[PDB]
Amino acid sequence: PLWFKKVRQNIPALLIISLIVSVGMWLERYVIIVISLERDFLPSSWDIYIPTIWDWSLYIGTFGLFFTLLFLFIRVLPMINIFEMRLFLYQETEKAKQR
Amino acid sequence: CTYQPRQYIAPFDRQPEGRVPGIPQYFASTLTLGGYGTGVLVRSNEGRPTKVEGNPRHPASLGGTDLFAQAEILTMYDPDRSTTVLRQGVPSTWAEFTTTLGNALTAARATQGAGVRLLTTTITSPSLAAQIEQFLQAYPQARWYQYEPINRDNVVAGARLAFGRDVTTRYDLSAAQVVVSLDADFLAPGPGFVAYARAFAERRKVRKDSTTMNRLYVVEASPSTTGTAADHRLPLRADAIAAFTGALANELGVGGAPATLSPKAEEFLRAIARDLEEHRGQSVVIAGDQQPPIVHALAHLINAELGNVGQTVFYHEPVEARPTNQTEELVALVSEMAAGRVETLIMIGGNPVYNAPGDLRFADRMASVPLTIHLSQFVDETSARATWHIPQAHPLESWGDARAFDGTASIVQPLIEPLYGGKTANELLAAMLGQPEAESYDLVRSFWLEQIGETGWQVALANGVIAETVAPVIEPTLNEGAIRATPIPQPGDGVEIVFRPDPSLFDGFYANNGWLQELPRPLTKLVWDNAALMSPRTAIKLLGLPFNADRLIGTEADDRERQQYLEQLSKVNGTIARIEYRGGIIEIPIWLLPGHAEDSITLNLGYGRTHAGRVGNNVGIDVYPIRTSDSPWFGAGARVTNTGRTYLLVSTQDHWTLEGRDIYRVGEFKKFKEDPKYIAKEVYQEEYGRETPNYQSLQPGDDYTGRNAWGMTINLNACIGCNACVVACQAENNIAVVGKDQVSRGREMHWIRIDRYFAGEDLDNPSIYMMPVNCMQCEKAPCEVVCPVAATVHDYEGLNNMVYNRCVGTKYCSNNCPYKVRRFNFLQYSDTTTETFKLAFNPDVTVRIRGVMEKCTYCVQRISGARIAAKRAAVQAGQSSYVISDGAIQTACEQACPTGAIVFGDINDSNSRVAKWKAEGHNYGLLGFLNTVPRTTYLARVRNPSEELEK
Ligand code: SF4
Ligand code: SF4
Ligand code: SF4
Ligand code: F3S
């Protein structure tokens, strides 16, 4: 859908696709690592990987740490570079003068 | 803070005379599995037993040992062994028992000992037999009444039918070109197992020079280790074997009965008969203990006709003291207990309440008896219901004598004073004979002195055998009329039940031992559990599973599809089936065994104990209640309804087939004689189009041309999948025992593993392949290259070095190991709180902590000791030679193997056995397309098929 311009313009469509892409990339890493490791050269050494609750707990915990750091960043420091944005305005005004 | 704690050191007060500190010693002792002694050499690190090995001078234990002898060390150090005398479960004293016993016996002297009864197992000790005979002389009306669940009653019954006298049958497999086995496991643990395995394996081992190989034909209800090492195997029902034996005698022309049989069985009969009469005096017929007495009588008759007697089969005077029908003697005792005639019962071991068949109701009849005394070495179920329980000294810590199947009279020697005290069986007999406080050492020595003499006693202790004692060869006379005039019962009464001793737990005595319970059972790979074993077809019909079961049958073209179907047929393993045999319901989970006979179920004894130690306290389902005295090893009718309610069964392998890969190589003998390299020349033609694969490597490696190089060769033809090597590695390298939950998560720690591939056409009657897998010590090792902290690096000799202290636990090395032989300590598996287990650990090898990887180290402790000793000898001589002998270093697995499949030696020394074996044309390394260049290599299996059955 991203190929079509209308889908890219729509803000809800972008959010849904971005969430699906984030899940798909996790699945890609899972496929590359776990599936390849499960079955190997010797058939006798074949077993299935079943994740427990503790690795999931670590995963949500890392999400929480990431968002905590983001929230402190946005509270204390500016989210948008104050300079390089007024310089961008200066560059845009000069472009208008040279048409 | 300081690097380490004070680490105080405590020395002796009086030095032992013959001991040099830090130097282990070896002592000769005897360990008995079925009451038949097997000579063992046991290492005493500092006065404590630590490692059991074989006695090269002992018949039936020439270096090789069975798993039960290996795992006796952990049994002697079980933290659940009895420590005190219990009156009625309350601690008491030995003196109080001696007073009570004396009063009870003098109260029974009014009669002739009519109330006094005994109950031992198969007793072969000359000292105990003489003491029991003297006690019977003192009390005329006393009875011995031997019994043990795994006995040889049918053998002696058949002997008394064929010869009219109890004889001891011995088989010389070295001179038998054809061996036929009627439901007989001679390659499974039992009397004479190590001797039979070594002789059979030597014939199977084939080199370019060799021109002859032995052939084995086996007919059996359940696939077994003997079945695995057979050129031809027929899965006949257990009841049908007696009819098959009668038919074989009839076609040979000896007295028998023609029996209707399946066409495959008839073809097998034609091949066996045709192979015989072509090898007269070069053939032997072996009948299993489970089979009925008529089968044994027919086997003696067939051997006499072929003239095999005196060449392959030898008859000797009976070695088991007084041979008797044990099941009938127990039935006589239970009836007397029900009547109330017995007033005193003394039992030396044997766990009678648990072991006795359910129909007998021994426990209910035991209550009637006023006094019952049990010597068990553990507080067993019988001891719990018995007054005056007395702890029994373990064989390692006790003075004793035992006789081998051939007859040896070997002497058991204590390596340590009893840890918890306890009394030997002879000491109990002495108290009954009126001599209390009699030392075991004096009782055994007094009997032996004046028979072999004081000088003989000294030689007997130094060696593991008594030269004077052996069974005399006798020539018995075969009674043709008695053997011919026998019923030969016909098979067929509905679903049948086969009762087989557990491969790892035996009769359930070893249920407490952790190593045996954790050991994967051969051919089923199950751990910590008991399951009903049935063929895939049997499960589909009885449990109504939705599978065709004919899809498995097919040609080589659809082999990959049929292997996938077998995986789909699996996952039904663990469904609980309620089985009703004779008024008894077992409710046991079912595990599918492909090679099993149709309409037959195998149930393993030794499970469901309730008074066993914390390990194996309640594991598996007890099969003893359903078992009946009239038919101990066979069953006639079983309902086998399916109750669903699937129960998790844990297996180590988790895959039953090789997926079209060159892991196991199998070739015919006739083609091998023309070209030894034919098996290797083939395969490469299918894969690359050329006879030789031109593997190319971008990595140099190391020369190793002028230095000792250590390599191992494993012979596929010799291996029988006994699993003795796995137990030997666990004892030698202090490998931890993980729980059933850890095995379920695939975290079992075993340096050596045996894999069953079950690969064949049909897949309902597959050919079992057993391959031992251990670190290959690859000259170019992938695991070493991926290690960040350099914990795994190579060695000057060529050994891969794994340093536990350096390992940080990344686990990258296991991922890059192609053979997946590396085991990681995910949790703290090692036991730190148990003093007895701490004594068991070998000092030479470190006890690993959590977070470190482990792998086979080619028994580095043995190699380092030999290298230090060779260097020390060279410097003292002044030669500076540093020469190590070929036989100087033997790995624990190499010593343990009864067959001799594993050989360890220098590769560079061309005169070493490993160098000669590695020059064979059928030697190869696993996964050659990876440029690992392993040092552990395999010899491709060579078979000897008869043109009748095969072509
Ligand atoms: S077998 Fe595995 S652990 Fe052993 S040397 Fe080879 S790659 Fe390393
Ligand atoms: S060589 Fe030693 S460590 Fe390796 S498998 Fe054999 S017994 Fe175990
Ligand atoms: S290699 Fe191991 S499993 Fe095979 S026969 Fe020898 S001891 Fe038994
Ligand atoms: S990668 Fe290395 S760090 Fe240990 S777990 Fe393996 S030897």
CB of B653 within 8 Å of a chain A CB? The answer is: yes
Q: Which residues of B touch A51 (CB under 8 A)?
A: none
Give the chain B residue nearest A34 (alpha carbons).
B815
Work out whether the CA dihedral B356, B360, B366, B372 comes out positive or negative: negative
CB of B819 within 8 Å of a chain A CB? The answer is: yes
For residue B640, the one-letter residue type is: V
Q: DSSP string of B328-391?
A: HHHHHHHHHHHHT--SEEEEESS-HHHHS-GGG-HHHHHHHSSEEEEE-SB--HHHHTSSSBB-
Contact B757 A44 (CB under 8 A): yes
Q: How far is the CA of B846 from the centre of ligand 1 (A)?
A: 20
Strands B801-802 and B168-171: unpaired
Q: How many CB pairs under 8 A join A and B?
A: 37
Q: How far is the CA of B823 from the centre of ligand 3 (A)?
A: 20
Annotated ligand binding at B729? The verdict is: yes
Q: What is the largest CA-CA distance in chain B?
A: 93
Give the chain A residue nearest B651 (alpha carbons).
A47
Q: What is the DSSP letter of A72?
A: H
CA dihedral defined by B419, B420, B425, B431, rounded to 10 degrees? 120
- Rounded-to-integer distance, Cα B116 and Cα B341, Å: 10
Q: What is the DSSP letter of B510?
A: G
Closest ligand 1 atom to Cα of B802: 3
Annotated ligand binding at B867? The verdict is: yes
Q: B344 - beta bridge partners?
A: B116, B371
Task: State how far the alpha carbon of B236 is from the alpha carbons of B223, B598, B623, in Å.
Answer: 10, 8, 23
CA proximity to B819, closest of B780, B783, B789, B858: B783
Alpha helices by DSSP H, listed for B139-228, are 153-162, 193-204, 225-228
With beta carbons less than 8 A apart as the criterion, state whether B819 and B813 touch.
no
B836 CB-near residues (< 8 Å, 6+ apart): B77, B78, B79, B419
Q: Which residues of B touch A34 (CB under 8 A)?
A: none
Q: Which residues of A touch B654 (CB under 8 A)?
A: 46-48
- Rounded-to-integer distance, Cα B361 and Cα B453, Å: 47
Contact B663 A46 (CB under 8 A): no
Phi-psi group of B723: left, alpha or beta (phi > 0 → left; psi -120 to 50 → alpha; rest → beta): left
Task: State how far the alpha carbon of B14 is from the alpha carbons of B44, B51, B419, B806, B839, in Å.
Answer: 19, 26, 20, 40, 22
With beta carbons less than 8 A apart as the criterion, state whether B479 and B27 touch.
no
B186-207 as b/e: b if 16+ CB within 10 A: bbbbbbbbbbbbbbbbebbbbe
Annotated ligand binding at B1? The verdict is: no
CB of A44 within 8 Å of a chain B CB? The answer is: yes
Token pair for A56: 């999931």
Contact A45 B657 (CB under 8 A): no
3-state secondary structure of B32: strand
Residue for token pair 């509905």? B494
Contact B927 A46 (CB under 8 A): no
CB of B658 within 8 Å of a chain A CB? The answer is: yes
Element holding B268 (H helix, E strand) = helix B263-275
Q: How far is the CA of B736 from the centre of ligand 1 (A)?
A: 21
B321 CB-near residues (< 8 Å, 6+ apart): B122, B123, B124, B125, B129
B453-469 as b/e: b if 16+ CB within 10 A: eeebbeebeebbbbeeb
Q: What is the DSSP letter of B651?
A: B
Whether B200 lines ligand 2, by a CB cut-off of 6 Å, is no
Token pair for B723: 């699993």
Annotated ligand binding at B859? The verdict is: yes
CA angle B491/B494/B496 to nearest 5° reads 75
CA proximity to B374, closest of B611, B687, B591, B192: B611
With beta carbons less than 8 A apart as the criterion, state whether B388 and B85 touch.
yes
Task: State how far the alpha carbon of B5 is from the alpha carbons of B1, B163, B402, B828, in Å.
Answer: 10, 72, 48, 22
How far is the alpha carbon of B820 from chain A, nearest alpha carbon, in Å? Answer: 7
Terminal-to-terminal C-alpha distance of chain A: 36
B36 CB-near residues (< 8 Å, 6+ apart): B122, B124, B191, B192, B319, B320, B402, B403, B404, B405
B70, B713, B733: which to mutate for ligand 2, most atoms within 8 A of CB? B733
Pocket of ligand 3 (CB under 6 A): B 719-725, 754, 772, 896-897, 899, 901-902
HEC-encoded secondary structure of B390-409: ECECCHHHCCEEECCCCCCC
CA proximity to B385, closest of B359, B399, B364: B364
B699 CB-near residues (< 8 Å, 6+ apart): B780, B931
Q: What is the DSSP letter of B560?
A: H
Element holding B588 (H helix, E strand) = strand B588-592
Q: Which residues of A touch B746 (CB under 8 A)?
A: 47
Phi, psi for residue B159 in degrees, rounded to 5: -65, -40
Q: How far is the CA of B752 from the centre of ligand 1 (A)?
A: 13
- Rounded-to-integer distance, Cα B589 and Cα B653, Å: 19
Q: How far is the CA of B892 from the centre of ligand 1 (A)?
A: 19
Annotated ligand binding at B871? The verdict is: yes
Whether B856 lines ligand 2, by a CB cut-off of 6 Å, is yes
B659-690 as b/e: b if 16+ CB within 10 A: beeebbbebbbeebbeebbbbbeeebeeeeee
Q: B592 - beta bridge partners?
A: B534
